[PDB]
From a paper:
We first solved the structure of the S protein alone that was purified in different batches and exhibited two conformations: the locked conformation and the active conformation, with overall resolutions of 2.7 Å and 3.3 Å, respectively. We did not observe the previously reported closed conformation, in which all RBD domains stay in “down” position but pack looser than that in the locked conformation. Transformation from the locked to the active state implies a tendency for S1 to become loose. The contact area between RBD and NTD of the S protein is reduced from the “down” RBD in locked conformation (locked-down) to the “down” RBD in active conformation (active-down) and to the “up” RBD in the active conformation (active-up). The S protein undergoes a clockwise twist from the locked conformation to the active conformation when looked from the S protein to the viral membrane, which loosens the NTD and SD1 domain by increasing the distance between the individual domain and the central axis.
The spike (S) protein on the surface of SARS-CoV-2 exploits angiotensin-converting enzyme 2 (ACE2) as cellular receptor and mediates the fusion of the viral and the host cell membrane during infection. The activation of the S protein requires the receptor-binding domain (RBD) binding to the peptidase domain (PD) of ACE2 and the cleavage by host proteases into the N-terminal S1 subunit and the C-terminal S2 subunit. S1 consists of the N-terminal domain (NTD), the RBD, subdomain 1 and 2 (SD1 and SD2). Here we report the cryo-electron microscopy (cryo-EM) structures of trimeric extracellular domain of the S protein (hereinafter referred to as S) at multiple states and conformations, including the all RBD-locked, activated, S1/S2 trypsin-cleaved, PD of ACE2-bound, and the full-length ACE2-bound states.
Numbering used by the authors:
A (entry chain A): 692 to 941, 944 to 1037
B (entry chain C): 544 to 618, 633 to 676, 690 to 741
C (entry chain C): 939 to 941, 944 to 1135
D (entry chain C): 298 to 395
E (entry chain B): 939 to 941, 944 to 987
Write the structure that this text describes.
């Protein structure tokens, strides 16, 4: 193990003089990726099932704390509807589902790796499929039946452990196929209409002339595009190939951290059911048997207070995380309107 | 042996050492037990399971409701069976009729399915993303506008909320 | 005047509901024998009423704490909204914005502010093209073994004749040497036409 | 359920979460070991000679039903206090290392 | 050089005040007989 002083970067010097200028003579077409989180998992909690279980004595003792559970569930539902609103602001910008024609004559540019693949069950692109397999979720579907984990399969499958304690995960409103349809419409509009479909009705224009407009927008004359069209198309195709390559090779850490954080929060909730909180045991059935009502109520009160504050901590941290995801989704919506529907 | 509880007992594959009688999971609840007369191990599984949601068009319009059992797959652990049973990737929906059309979402059920109080009864459908469109793209065709419209739109933004103060002692 | 400002009414509703929830949470025992201090202080003597009063104090303190925490979170969200509104005031009202969909749908022309209870309303005036028409087009024009490109327009053709127009409004004009500029010969551009 | 969790008699259009699906127990079962004898209540409480407190006696008890109601006719205790358990629960339990 | 950076000093002030408030909150009984563990552990037996 070695320890060193970190370097800030390579040293450089500019040959500045009062009558010297440097002018470029060639260019490169670069393609870069930017990843942004847009939603997190929507969860719900049953207080009675988490705090008491099937205990009727505990559930009758809990009726002095019903306002707190209505409050918790109000907060969680606010988060849950905010997630769907986030996805809608990002992806549902345009409400016309444009298709790209079978005329794949785009001046030499090849958009085959980002356009839908009709050979799949879904209509996801090649790049979208490569992205889909680099993020491992925790819920492959949202129907886990009672008979499916009945026995010791519970408390060995974390999801049934969460479900037996009242912790539910709700499915998003837009399926993945609908989101793929939205991105497909955005791509088709942007490659057959330029930036006009974001300001009104889509007005077609040949792709090379649209690229010449975009070259004008950065301070380069159009003849620079028209005289170098094959070189530019080849550079673009090579850069797109480089992306797929890199991906299929080896990540989406910022999107996996969201899944990891939500799963860890739920599992921490489940393990915090082993705390005594100052009682004689952490099981309601060891207290309710070996102790009679009036003097078991003190222990059950300790347990109730502890578990309520556990739920409260969870909900608070979920609210804070949802605020951060909301900021990220707002940034993604701004980038969608200003980089995809226009030129910045 | 004095330990009380509620649940479902099933035959087990766990195998206890001779000095063991109960088995506990990570939440420290008893999930296995050795029967004191037959000396066989049993698993104890809880009895309640599965979320439930209720879809109403508002009780100021009707007291018809639909119920979504978010963990059932019918092709049951339901309160009633009625008619119009419709399976969804969000659960089994009971009380709403499935149609083949598609509209804008009214009440979001989930997984692409919405519900609405149409024709009265409750219907469930797949939400539509929008009208389909196609651009007449060719390699030498352009579309140029010949007129314009001046549009005025509103945008609302919250700027403040209520300023409050609390006296601890008085509360 | 017909028929809403839901985003501005939700703020009022949320604050009122939070205060009223605080008030109703004064009916909780929190594990004591009653939720009234006067039923405890009468029928119980100091040292053994102190346990009940301690339970009540702890419960009500945590109620206040929950309220303050959720108020802080909501205030952060309102702060973000107010920052966005200030940016929109400086960039859409005090200027003209080139950012797409920042000051309405269309090409932004101007904006006017109006005040509302706890908020602001922007009236965005934008320009939306309409009544489009199809034309044949070309990237360049070849005249004397030279390629001519438009200066600030696009080459269109009504079917037989060629004109140069502006991109956002059909206003055809005759192609001259003041509309175009020359660069190179007629062998490199792909869809060049003779005119 | 929703009317009552809302604390209102009117419900507005929408979808609301209710409690998880509950199932009620149908039967009650008890499973104790096969024990037939009664515990030596008459050679612990009715012994003829007790020990000195400095050399107190300790006796092991196992494999017997602890039906203490048989002590109601022949015994009257001036002090009886249990720690860690309730006296009203002693008839339902089962005891280890007595 | 004359005369400020209030927005940068408020951050330092807030963090310092939070830590010091943590330290002074060690003088609360929270409903116990004292706020010192050594006064409880001496004069009282474990249970
Ligand atoms: C532009 O001209 C300058 C002037 O010679 C070149 O820069 C110097 O390069 C040498 C060798 O790399 C360095 O040791 C000097 O420090 C540089 N700076 C000076 C002398 O001020 C530079 O290479 C030229 N740039 C191009 C693109 O040709
Ligand atoms: C501008 O740069 C490109 C490279 O990006 C040059 O084209 C390359 O030329 C070399 C040598 O002729 C070939 O081996 C490569 O295959 C070319 N690249 C591509 C993508 O075709 C081009 O010559 C440069 N232009 C000038 C004027 O220097
Ligand atoms: C551009 O559109 C406007 C409508 O926005 C047209 O003006 C309308 O013309 C019709 C028929 O002449 C009248 O009934 C309306 O009263 C006019 N509207 C207004 C607001 O005055 C206009 O003719 C169109 N121009 C072209 C060249 O088509
Ligand atoms: C394209 O536009 C030109 C206008 O320059 C049309 O040609 C003129 O049409 C007018 C009226 O029909 C005649 O008086 C002129 O003699 C024509 N020629 C010129 C040089 O002005 C032409 O008809 C249009 N073509 C189509 C298909 O609409
Ligand atoms: C407890 O008593 C039961 C009977 O009350 C015993 O059950 C017997 O078990 C044998 C197995 O070797 C069977 O052949 C008998 O038919 C059972 N009897 C009944 C009535 O079911 C049991 O064996 C006893 N416990 C022990 C440890 O021996
Ligand atoms: C302890 O000794 C007493 C007295 O010898 C026993 O009590 C008798 O119990 C029977 C049955 O309940 C009664 O009919 C008699 O009246 C009792 N004796 C007297 C003097 O009243 C008792 O059974 C002995 N305990 C044990 C465990 O054997
Ligand atoms: C290279 C790739 O990924 N896909 C195809 C390839 O399979 C096919 O041979 C080629 C010509 O049809 O076009 C491309
Ligand atoms: C009864 C039923 O729904 N069966 C389907 C089966 O046809 C389908 O192939 C499978 C796909 O995973 O899902 C299940
Ligand atoms: C031909 C083409 O490319 N696009 C459309 C075509 O799909 C449509 O049927 C027709 C009638 O509106 O208008 C044009
Ligand atoms: C008048 C004129 O320029 N005619 C030329 C012709 O000679 C040549 O064969 C053809 C192909 O390049 O292009 C044209
Ligand atoms: C586009 O590139 C792919 C390689 O991924 C190739 O299969 C396809 O033939 C290319 N399209 C054209 C028109 O050359
Ligand atoms: C619902 O009932 C109230 C009172 O009966 C009434 O004021 C209200 O207008 C009703 N809702 C509608 C949409 O009419
Ligand atoms: C219901 O069961 C069928 C086959 O048993 C399965 O294909 C389907 O996925 C299940 N329901 C859902 C929506 O998962
Ligand atoms: C609805 O869609 C189904 C899909 O198979 C089709 O069979 C049916 O004819 C359509 N009309 C109905 C059943 O209302
Ligand atoms: C443009 O021409 C195409 C090809 O027939 C047609 O689909 C479309 O209606 C035309 N657009 C206009 C605005 O005339
Ligand atoms: C446009 O495509 C046609 C095919 O219909 C082809 O003949 C022509 O050369 C192409 N022109 C350009 C500029 O791409
Ligand atoms: C354009 O003009 C040149 C010279 O007159 C001629 O060689 C060329 O073939 C022409 N192009 C077409 C498409 O007629």
């Amino acid at each position: 193990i070695i320890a060193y002083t970190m370097s800030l970067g390579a040293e450089n010097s500019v040959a500045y003089s009062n009558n010297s200028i440097a002018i470029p003579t060639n260019f490169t077409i670069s393609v870069t990726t930017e990843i942004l989180p847009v939603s997190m998992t929507k969860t719900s909690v049953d207080c009675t099932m988490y705090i008491c279980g099937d205990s009727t004595e505990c559930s009758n003792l809990l009726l002095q704390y019903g306002s707190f559970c209505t409050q918790l569930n109000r907060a969680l539902t606010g988060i849950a509807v905010e997630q769907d609103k986030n996805t809608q602001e990002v992806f549902a910008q345009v409400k016309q589902i444009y298709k790209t024609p079978p005329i794949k004559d785009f001046g030499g540019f090849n958009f085959s790796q980002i356009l839908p693949d009709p050979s799949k069950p879904s209509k996801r692109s090649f790049i979208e499929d490569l992205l889909f397999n680099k993020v491992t979720l925790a819920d492959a579907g949202f129907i886990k039946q009672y008979g499916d984990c009945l026995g010791d399969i519970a408390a060995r499958d974390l999801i049934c452990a969460q479900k037996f304690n009242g912790l539910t995960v709700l499915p998003p409103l837009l399926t993945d196929e609908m989101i793929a349809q939205y991105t497909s419409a955005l791509l088709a509009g942007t490659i057959t209409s330029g930036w006009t479909f974001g300001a009104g009705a889509a007005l077609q224009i040949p792709f090379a002339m649209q690229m010449a407009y975009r070259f004008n927008g950065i301070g380069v004359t159009q003849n620079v595009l028209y005289e170098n069209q094959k070189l530019i198309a080849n550079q673009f195709n090579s850069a797109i190939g480089k992306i797929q390559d890199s991906l299929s090779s080896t990540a989406l850490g910022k999107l996996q951290d969201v899944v990891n954080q939500n799963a860890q929060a739920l599992n921490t909730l489940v393990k915090q059911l082993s705390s005594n909180f100052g009682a004689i045991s952490s099981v309601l059935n060891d207290i309710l048997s070996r102790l009679d009502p009036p003097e078991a109520e003190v222990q059950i009160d300790r347990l109730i207070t502890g578990r309520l504050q556990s739920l409260q901590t969870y909900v608070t941290q979920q609210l804070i995380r949802a605020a951060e995801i909301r900021a990220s989704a707002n940034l993604a919506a701004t980038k969608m309107s200003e980089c995809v529907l226009g030129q910045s | 042996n004095g330990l009380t509880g509620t649940g479902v007992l099933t035959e087990s594959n766990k195998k206890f050492l001779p000095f063991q009688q109960f088995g506990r999971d990570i939440a420290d609840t008893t999930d296995a037990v050795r029967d004191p007369q037959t000396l066989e191990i049993l698993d104890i599984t809880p009895c309640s399971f599965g979320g439930v949601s209720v879809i109403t068009p508002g009780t100021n319009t009707s007291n018809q409701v639909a119920v979504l059992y978010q963990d059932v797959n019918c092709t049951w652990r339901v309160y009633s069976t009625g008619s119009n049973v419709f399976q969804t990737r969000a659960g089994c929906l009971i009380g709403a009729e499935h149609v083949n059309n598609s509209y804008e979402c009214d009440i979001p059920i989930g997984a692409g399915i919405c519900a609405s109080y149409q024709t009265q009864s409750i219907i469930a459908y797949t939400m539509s993303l929008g009208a389909e469109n196609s651009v007449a793209y060719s390699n030498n065709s352009i579309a140029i506008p010949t007129n314009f419209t001046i549009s005025v739109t509103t945008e609302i933004l919250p700027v403040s909320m209520t300023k409050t103060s609390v006296d601890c002692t008085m509360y | 005047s017909s028929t809403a400002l839901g985003k501005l009414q939700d703020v009022v509703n949320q604050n009122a509901q939070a205060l009223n929830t605080l008030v109703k949470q004064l009916s909780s025992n929190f594990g004591a024998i009653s939720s009234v201090l006067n039923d405890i202080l009468s029928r119980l003597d100091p040292p053994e009423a102190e346990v009940q009063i301690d339970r009540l104090i702890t419960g009500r303190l945590q109620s206040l704490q929950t309220y303050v925490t959720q108020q802080l979170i909501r205030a952060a969200e309102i702060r973000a909204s107010a920052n966005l509104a200030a940016t929109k005031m400086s960039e859409c009202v005090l200027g003209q914005s080139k950012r797409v969909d920042f000051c309405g749908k269309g090409y932004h022309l101007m904006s006017f502010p109006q005040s509302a209870p706890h908020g602001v309303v922007f009236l965005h005036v934008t320009y939306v093209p309409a009544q489009e028409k199809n034309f044949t087009t070309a990237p360049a024009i070849c005249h004397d073994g030279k390629a001519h490109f438009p200066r600030e327009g696009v080459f269109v053709s009504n079917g037989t004749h060629w004109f140069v127009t502006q991109r956002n409004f059909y206003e055809p004009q005759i192609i001259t040497t003041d509309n175009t500029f020359v660069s190179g010969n007629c062998d490199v551009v792909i869809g060049i036409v003779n005119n | 359920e929703t009317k009552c969790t809302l604390k209102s008699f009117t419900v507005e259009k929408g979808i609301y979460q209710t409690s998880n699906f509950r199932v009620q127990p149908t039967e009650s079962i008890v499973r104790f070991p096969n024990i037939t004898n009664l515990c030596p209540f008459g050679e612990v409480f009715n012994a003829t000679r007790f020990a000195s407190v400095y050399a107190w006696n300790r006796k092991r008890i196992s494999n017997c039903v602890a039906d203490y109601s048989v002590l109601y006719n022949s015994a009257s205790f001036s002090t009886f206090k249990c720690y860690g358990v309730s006296p009203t629960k002693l008839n339902d339990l089962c005891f280890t290392n007595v």
